[PDB]
Amino acid sequence: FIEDSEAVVAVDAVSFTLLQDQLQSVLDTLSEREAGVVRLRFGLTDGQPRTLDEIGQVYGVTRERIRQIESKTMSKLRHPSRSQVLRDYL
């Protein structure tokens, strides 16, 4: 009679898969620089979260430029067009 409060919720796992897919599509709407900065900044490609200096190094620019592209991209995604699609997962 002991519910294991750690089991796979079934709907949670499939929901996470759907979130992965939808987020991937939305990020693919971003420009190449934008998609790259987002994926690296939030570790969507290897699970390692790269920080601003690493991202500026692998793109060969200054970290201030990386942060500006970051802010611009975030604001673009906050736009309801590509936002309301992902609201429900949260």
Partner: protein, 106 residues
Amino acid sequence: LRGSRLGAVSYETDRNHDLAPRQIARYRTDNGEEFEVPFADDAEIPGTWLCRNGMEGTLIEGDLPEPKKVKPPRTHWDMLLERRSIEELEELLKERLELIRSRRRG
């Protein structure tokens, strides 16, 4: 009632392709059995290891980096020697020596 073994669960695809490359290291046990221990590439490989058998096993690669022996557990001799002096046990030894050899000569 609701309980759960103290722990956690993850929901991520088990990608079998893009991982961190491993590096199998051999660790010979005292009896000599070999037990593979996969290690990552950029990873300081230890000379010794606790193997799958459960006894300490050293690298098949030649390292032999000092046994690092420890002080012996206090012995009965240690617990006796403090309270009593060597010369003091000497007279008792001679008493038993004469006792048993008197039995012998008899």
